[PDB]
């Protein structure tokens, strides 16, 4: 859902629903953490400094900033996908007539030659 | 006696020597591969009894190196 109906408008993270549990040491977090390290490699390409890998130790600021913002950004990702599924399952339960079930068949299909 | 037509030869003959030296270096497990059939038994055709389905090798016939 795009427009809020049950969720509170303008939230820092969620706060209305907190129970979901965020991912711990996820493969998704590692890629954002890799980009934080990658940003601390190409910064020495702009301002000409000796060695991209073994240069200035202000790289720790670049890794942490990508992790801290990324953790909050992925927390919203797990939240928004949950609400999207929650409203989907509630739509089937309340209406029932919109959904139809079919199982087990013996229907003929056209066979291809050559 | 004549001086005759000249080729490089030194670069050419060395490569064939350098190639075969590393074939011979890994020609030892080729020699062991023959003795693996000789010393160790390969496989026998027999009906399986209901006790164990797979142990070490699940289903492999011929050559001990396959298992």
């Amino acid at each position: 859902x795009x427009x809020x109906x049950x969720x509170x408008x303008x939230x820092x993270x969620x706060x209305x629903x907190x129970x979901x549990x965020x991912x711990x040491x996820x493969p998704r977090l590692a890629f954002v953490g890799f980009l934080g390290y990658c940003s601390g490699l190409i910064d020495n390409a702009i301002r000409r400094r000796p060695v991209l890998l073994a240069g200035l130790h202000r790289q720790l600021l670049y890794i942490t900033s990508f992790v801290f913002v990324g953790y909050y950004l992925l927390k919203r990702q797990d939240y928004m996908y949950a609400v999207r599924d929650h409203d989907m399952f509630s739509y089937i339960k309340s209406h029932x007539x919109x959904x139809x079930x079919x199982x087990x068949x013996x229907x003929x299909x056209x066979x291809x030659x050559x | 006696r004549l001086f005759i037509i000249k080729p490089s030869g030194f670069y050419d003959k060395r490569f064939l020597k350098l190639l075969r030296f590393y074939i011979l270096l890994t020609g030892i497990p080729v020699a062991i591969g023959i003795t693996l059939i000789n010393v160790x038994x390969x496989x026998x055709x027999x009906x399986x009894x209901x006790x164990x389905x797979x142990x070490x090798x699940x289903x492999x016939x011929x050559x001990x190196x396959x298992x």
Binding site: X112, X114 | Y11, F15, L16
Partner: protein, 457 residues
């Protein structure tokens, strides 16, 4: 198991000292290629999925092993080039091959169509930078722009094709889930649905029309000859034609009928030009059109026998054409021109390389069962079940298959070399090693070609 050690090649070349570089990039790549054969070959009746859908198992793809085979070989022939220039420039264009190897593994492994598409066009980016730089002759841009504006013009219609399928019929994803697919009713609205899935693979696999993408990429050489092996990988990189035709459109073969006829004339006319041509690299460039045209014929028949010949020819051509380009590079490094007539002289000046010239040329023809006899002949046998007329056209092509190879031999088998004074040393220890690393894997496939053709084999 496959990805991650390939990614670790990137910090390997940069961290190592300036005197080394080439020793670390070649040796470490060889042990990863050994482990690819160790695990991927194991399969049951139907090949079961590897893990979660990021990189999946191989069902009918022993072609991944070929990419692992060229993984060190794309560094061996490029040793003669790049050495004159800066040390930082050397490290950059080894890592562009590593990035190519990273994306090429992902294409064949991952059993997908949605995420496969963003890896299919992703191989074009590193090759573009590779082609547009280090080109000794001019018109790099008249080949570099043509490299994308042929492929991307045909492949961008996959966005309107693939997404249209998953929005209506379940989801594409695993392909092992893809049995939701119902046969196409065949209507005028369903014409552009089939064309958009095909036209993407009609460019990478060259036909008679829209085929000029390939000769421009080969004649205008990227770096020496090792990058031309990656251009061979792009031809077989469009392997999804094996997957789309079988699953997405099984009933649709009536619209395939004009496209077979186009590729059938892309056998006589593509071979005729490959006779009177001047450039040594061009006479491999046009023979590679006809050899890959055989595969396109086999796919559109959809018979179980044809896919056996199709999968064989992908590996057969991937190690014979690349072998021929290394021989073209070995003459390009000595004579400094790609002219066939000027670069004339085998056996007298090149005593041991001439035997490698013979073995590479004859493999284009139907030799004792190496891979090309299991490749070409299987398609010709399958075409008769389609129509009786085919072998009258296909037999003429079998005459001109000699006319690629023998004309390349004879125009170099004259021991004159009056104008030429260079080429003192015949071949370095690495140069002779290149020629052996292409033919001897095919000579090992004589004993067991089960891992050379396997769609339900």
């Amino acid at each position: 198991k496959y990805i991650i050690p390939t990614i670790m090649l990137m910090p390997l070349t940069w961290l190592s000292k300036n005197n080394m570089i080439w020793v670390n990039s070649t040796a470490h790549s060889l042990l990863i290629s050994f482990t690819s054969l160790l695990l991927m070959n194991q399969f049951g009746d139907n090949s079961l999925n590897f893990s979660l859908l990021f990189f999946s198992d191989s069902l009918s793809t022993p072609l991944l092993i070929l990419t692992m085979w060229l993984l060190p070989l794309m560094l061996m022939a490029s040793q003669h080039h790049l050495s004159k220039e800066n040390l930082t420039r050397k490290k950059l264009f080894i890592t562009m091959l590593i990035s190519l190897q990273l994306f090429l593994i992902m294409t064949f492994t991952a059993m997908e169509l949605i995420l496969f598409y963003i890896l299919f066009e992703a191989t074009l980016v590193p090759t573009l930078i590779i082609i547009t730089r280090w080109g000794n002759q001019t018109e790099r841009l008249n080949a570099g722009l043509y490299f994308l504006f042929y492929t991307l013009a045909g492949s961008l219609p996959l966005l309107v094709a693939l997404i249209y399928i998953q929005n209506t019929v379940g989801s594409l994803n695993f392909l092992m889930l893809q049995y939701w697919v119902q046969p196409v009713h065949n209507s005028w609205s369903n014409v552009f649905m089939w064309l958009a899935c095909m036209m993407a693979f009609m460019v990478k696999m060259p036909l008679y029309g829209l085929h000029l993408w390939l000769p421009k990429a080969h004649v205008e050489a990227p770096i020496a000859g090792s990058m031309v092996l990656a251009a061979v990988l792009l031809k077989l990189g469009g392997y999804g034609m094996l997957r789309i035709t079988l699953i997405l459109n099984p009933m649709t073969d009536f619209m395939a009928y004009p496209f077979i006829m186009l590729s059938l004339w892309g056998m006589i006319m593509t071979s005729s030009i490959c006779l009177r041509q001047t450039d040594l690299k061009s006479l491999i460039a046009y023979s590679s059109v006809s050899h890959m045209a055989l595969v396109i014929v086999a796919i559109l028949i959809q018979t179980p026998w044809s896919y056996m010949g199709a999968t064989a020819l992908m590996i057969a051509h991937g190690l014979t054409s690349s072998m021929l380009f290394c021989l073209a590079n070995s003459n390009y490094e000595r004579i400094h021109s790609r002219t066939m007539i000027l670069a004339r002289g085998l056996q007298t000046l090149l005593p041991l390389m001439a035997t490698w010239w013979l073995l590479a040329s004859l493999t284009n023809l139907a030799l004792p069962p190496t891979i090309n006899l299991i490749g070409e002949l299987f398609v010709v046998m399958s075409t008769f079940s389609w129509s009786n007329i085919t072998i009258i056209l296909m037999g003429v092509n079998m005459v001109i298959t000699a006319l690629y190879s023998l004309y390349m031999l004879i125009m170099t088998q004259r021991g004159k070399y009056t104008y030429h004074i260079n080429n003192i040393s015949p071949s370095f220890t690495r140069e002779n090693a290149l020629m052996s690393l292409h033919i001897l894997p095919l000579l090992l496939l004589t004993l067991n070609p089960k891992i050379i053709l396997g769609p339900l084999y």
